[PDB]
Amino acid sequence: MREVISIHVGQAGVQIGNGCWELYCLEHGIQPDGQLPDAFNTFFSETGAGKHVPRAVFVDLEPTVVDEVRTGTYRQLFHPEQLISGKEDAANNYARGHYTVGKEIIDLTLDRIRKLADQCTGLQGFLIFHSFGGGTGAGFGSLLLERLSVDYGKKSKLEFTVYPSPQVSTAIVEPYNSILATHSMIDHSDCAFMVDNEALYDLCRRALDIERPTYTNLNRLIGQVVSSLTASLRFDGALNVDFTEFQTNLVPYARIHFPICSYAPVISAEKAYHEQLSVAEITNSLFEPANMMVKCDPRHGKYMACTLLYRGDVVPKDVSAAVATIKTKRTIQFVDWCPTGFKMGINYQPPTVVPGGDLAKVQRAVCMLANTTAIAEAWSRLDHKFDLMYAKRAFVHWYVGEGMEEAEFPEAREDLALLEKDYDEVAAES
């Protein structure tokens, strides 16, 4: 049929992934062993049995995270080849994960992804996950994209990354890795999505009612957005959207691709007793800055083209009235040369709930992908933090000793500065 391939990098990517696949197998109706007690072809392959197999590759440079899957309940679902683990991690060092340790395993992985693409007759794109601060997430991810760009070329490579938070930080060397990775990402990636942990903490405590979350709750929220994104290719709908449509509609230029995410309704469902959650309600909830998955307020910036994805009981008549209302709102800006500004899609299948769940089984929901100039706020913070450390050269010796040349630090610093004025010039109007 039509196929999408998933690649997962690092602790974040792998353990986000098993959250994603527990969702899909429960959604399609496949037991964890691959047996059964449609759209299977888009994500799975069938063997000479009643057994299925996912189209996924798990990659990390240390064995602890992957081995949890190997001894877990889902161990029988995955092919033993798909789970790739290194010997010693990159120690949050981009150079170590790019030159010295990255090249030790790069060609082993590239055979396995290519071999999986042979079984995909109607391959249309890849899905790749990152955490910017990690050495493997940024370093090995850059090496993977550079090779993948020449391997496949004119195929849509979509990415789903976790932007380092404005104030919450777990790595001191975190700004160094993000900027160096941003160089490799920007030229090769077709389109990549930003989310950050700090906003996901705030939403999961405010909207969902949890006093103390873990990464487990956050990983399940991310899976819903990817589930809604891929629902168009799998189940029926009155307005279908393919991957290639996202590439053309959302990005006005080559270097300005980065959108942000949103989803509604996110509700602890005892609160859902009180309300019916019509189409107008969920449409309004998308545009509040509190619901953004990236902790940047759009009111500092402006909107370019936005994509709306509806699931469930939504009817095409009600959509048109709702989006017409949001255009009247004078808390929302649009750049002048984007009068249309919207791409809409409707699918019939409502979201799927999970045992030990967090969300509701509501009957309708909406997902959003929006490109805004408010993301320029995030780049200024990361750039500012980078300059503080680099002026006194606070951590260069670790990178240079692991195969990195120093001249890459300012050149990667120059391109982000160009990107910073790329966003400022586009933000202007005539």
């Binding site: 270097r255 750039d383 300059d387 120059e414 500065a417």
Partner: protein, 56 residues
């Protein structure tokens, strides 16, 4: 009596009016931002042009 008039200035114990506790309570406005918040280093801060081809 002019000396007495000069002795009792028209304040009449409107002196020492502001106390230590009240100066603790009073609202203080926001100060100028610190230099650390400003720090984008000069040569990159000064850059002039961009890579996007928007003009014709």
């Amino acid at each position: 009596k002019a000396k007495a008039k000069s002795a009792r200035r028209p304040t009449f114990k409107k002196a020492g009016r502001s106390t230590r506790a009240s100066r603790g309570h009073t609202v203080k406005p926001a100060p100028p931002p610190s230099e650390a918040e400003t720090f984008k280093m000069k040569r990159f801060k000064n850059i002039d042009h961009y890579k996007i081809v928007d003009y014709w």
